[PDB]
Write a protein that binds this DNA or RNA. Structure first.
Lengths: 155, 77, 71, 101
RNA sequence: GGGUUAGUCGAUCCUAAGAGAUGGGGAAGCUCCGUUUCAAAGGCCUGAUUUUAUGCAGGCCACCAUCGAAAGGGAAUCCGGUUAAGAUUCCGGAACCUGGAUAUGGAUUCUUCACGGUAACGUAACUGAAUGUGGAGACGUCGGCGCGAGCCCUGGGAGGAGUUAUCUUUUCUUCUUAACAGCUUAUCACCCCGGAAUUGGUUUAUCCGGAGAUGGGGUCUUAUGGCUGGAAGAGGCCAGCACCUUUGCUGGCUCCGGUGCGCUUGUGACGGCCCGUGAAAAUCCACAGGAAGGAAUAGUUUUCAUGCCAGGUCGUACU
């Protein structure tokens, strides 16, 4: 499958069947980025209007949860590939770290818990954290700043 | 009638609590033109419309039959 | 009319000429305590009004037919 | 070889009373009455069909959502776009000329 | 004697040529003229109208009854089954329309009434009264040219039937897919970039371009087509058992293609014709306007989704 994020929607295509299989309706006007949960049935999306949307792909096409933990446009959302963590990064110079448990088999929806607000990046010309990425194994997050730095966040 | 692709969306309709009855259906078809395979079709009677879900793989089909609620009526072929 | 009870789940009544579908739906529900799915009507050639009255899947047409008399 | 009737009691070829011949699941031909074709909505000035508006019968617009019937520009539902352009240009210059008078 | 079952097919509703009460006026009179006319021809908003103390005050709006189409206009239903005789009306399943209550989900809001795209415009949503403006309803005929459907023609394979004196890998037949829903698709048209004589593009038909062509990249209508759902469970073609029975019961196969000044029909963009230029109204929608109404401790959106209830009267047999 290929996930395609426009400013307003996320469309999921099956490259084998060559057809659209799902259209997500995040309810934002200015989506900025998506990431896909490593077990493949959930998605997060950032928006310039300060929101992060969690979509449970099988549950409904509208957001399962709307996260409002930023004072400014959110530029990146990123899942850890192995640990039950994800992050959002915004123009307020802040990164927010979350826990998420997903229940693959049983009739329970995801458990999302905010964990930590990471501060340190300097806001430059209304820009803050421009990108972020998790370490593939460790609970370590790397961030890219408008302040000319990249940074490593650790336990 | 209304097809659904997504698996999460089907489990919401079973818990919607207008749906009195469902029905399962099994069809023999041939993939590409190489060999036969055993398709399934999980249909569910909504009040307005008939929602349905086409699963091609036989392994995923058998777990889906268990994943239905017991309180819902289910009807084979 | 025996045939329409088992296959159709349909009661067949004779009705007053001045009655309509709404009154037949109300009067069947009042007397026998049964939910009606739909009523159809036709005026007979002899001049009475026949009324085919299908019931819902919950309430059986067979059971009410024993209680009324004609069966 | 197989031939086909009017379903309805009108036996004449009126604008309303048209037919398509259709093959059924029963495996026989049958008439199906086609409803009359929707014309496009027009721009009430330049006099041409105008984009992003659905072609429906006039009652059928009541069923359909707002984003079908409208477009997002001011005067969008009822103007050509190029003819909306003109009157914004015109309003601005004539209003500016009124101060010069 | 039996037989005609409808929210979805009609009537009913709208107006056409025309008919015709009322207000009036003629006529000894039966009645005649006239149809929005020399009529006090109703129904909407506000009000401690601030004092007269237990009585209606201040404003707003502007034409006209009704009848007249089972072929004009017009909300919405399809397949399969069934009867001695009925079905778009019964049965089974699958749909839609109108009107009304509200309640959860989503969306929107502390910048209260969404965001994106340079733009054509886009999306599941994304307040709106008076009044005003616009579109649909809404329309000639002929001519060829393009596109679609149904039929016709035709090949392989899986069944069934006939021919066989001799010949014929043979002749005939079955191999189907509804409304409705979701994705996707097209001429015309439109936008952006760019600046054309060494003039170019282009239709069967010679019209188009510095009022911006050719070219490259877009946006839109969804007639129509395609793909899945409906839906193989249906229907069709075969095979075999039970047997006074008014009787069941069980197996298979239902596949993959091709052709065109073909025929019928629907539609598109064009062209010809006139001292002919080829209905109206109901109904629906949009746009301009902003009366006013809504949140930070919970409101606003029932033009997004899902859910609840209801649908009268008469015609329906057959020629």
């Amino acid at each position: 499958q290929l996930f395609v994020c426009s400013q307003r929607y996320v469309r999921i295509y099956d490259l084998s069947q060559q057809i659209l299989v799902k259209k997500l309706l995040p309810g934002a006007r200015w989506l900025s980025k998506i990431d896909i949960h490593p077990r493949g049935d959930n998605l997060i999306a950032s928006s310039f209007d300060k929101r992060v949307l969690w979509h449970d792909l099988d549950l409904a096409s509208t957001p399962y949860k709307t996260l409002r933990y930023h004072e400014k446009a959110v530029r990146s959302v990123n899942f850890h590939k192995k640990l039950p963590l994800f992050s959002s990064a915004a123009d307020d110079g802040t990164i927010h770290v979350f826990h998420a448990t997903v229940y693959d088999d049983m009739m329970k929806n995801p458990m999302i818990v905010p964990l930590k607000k990471l501060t340190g990046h300097k806001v430059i010309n209304s820009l803050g954290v421009l990108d972020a990425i998790w370490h593939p194994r460790e609970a370590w997050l790397f961030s890219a700043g408008a302040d000319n730095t990249a940074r490593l966040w650790t336990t | 009638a209304r097809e659904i692709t997504d698996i999460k969306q089907f489990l919401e309709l079973t818990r919607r609590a207008d749906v009195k009855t469902a029905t399962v259906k099994i069809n023999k078809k041939l993939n590409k033109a190489g060999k036969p395979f055993r398709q399934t079709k999980f249909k569910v009677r909504g009040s307005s419309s008939l929602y349905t879900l086409v699963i091609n793989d036989a392994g995923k089909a058998k777990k889906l039959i268990q994943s239905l609620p017991p309180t819902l009526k289910v009807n084979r072929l | 009319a025996m045939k329409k009870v088992e296959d159709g789940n349909i009661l067949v009544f004779q009705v007053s000429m001045k009655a309509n579908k709404y009154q037949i739906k109300k009067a069947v529900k009042e007397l026998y305590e049964v939910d009606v799915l739909k009523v159809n009507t036709l005026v007979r050639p002899n001049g009475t009004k026949k009324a085919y009255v299908r019931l819902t899947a919950d309430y059986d047409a067979l059971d009410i037919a024993n209680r009324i008399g004609y069966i | 070889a197989q031939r086909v009737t009017f379903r309805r009691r009108n036996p004449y070829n009126t604008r309303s009373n048209k037919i398509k011949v259709v093959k059924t699941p029963g495996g026989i031909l049958r008439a199906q009455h086609v409803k009359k074709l929707a014309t496009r909505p027009k721009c009430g000035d330049c006099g041409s069909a105008l984009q992003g508006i659905s072609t429906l019968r006039p009652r059928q617009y009541a069923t359909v959502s707002k984003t079908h019937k409208t477009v997002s520009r001011a005067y969008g539902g009822s103007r050509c776009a190029n003819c909306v352009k003109e009157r914004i240009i015109r309003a601005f210059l004539i209003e500016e000329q009124k101060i010069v008078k």
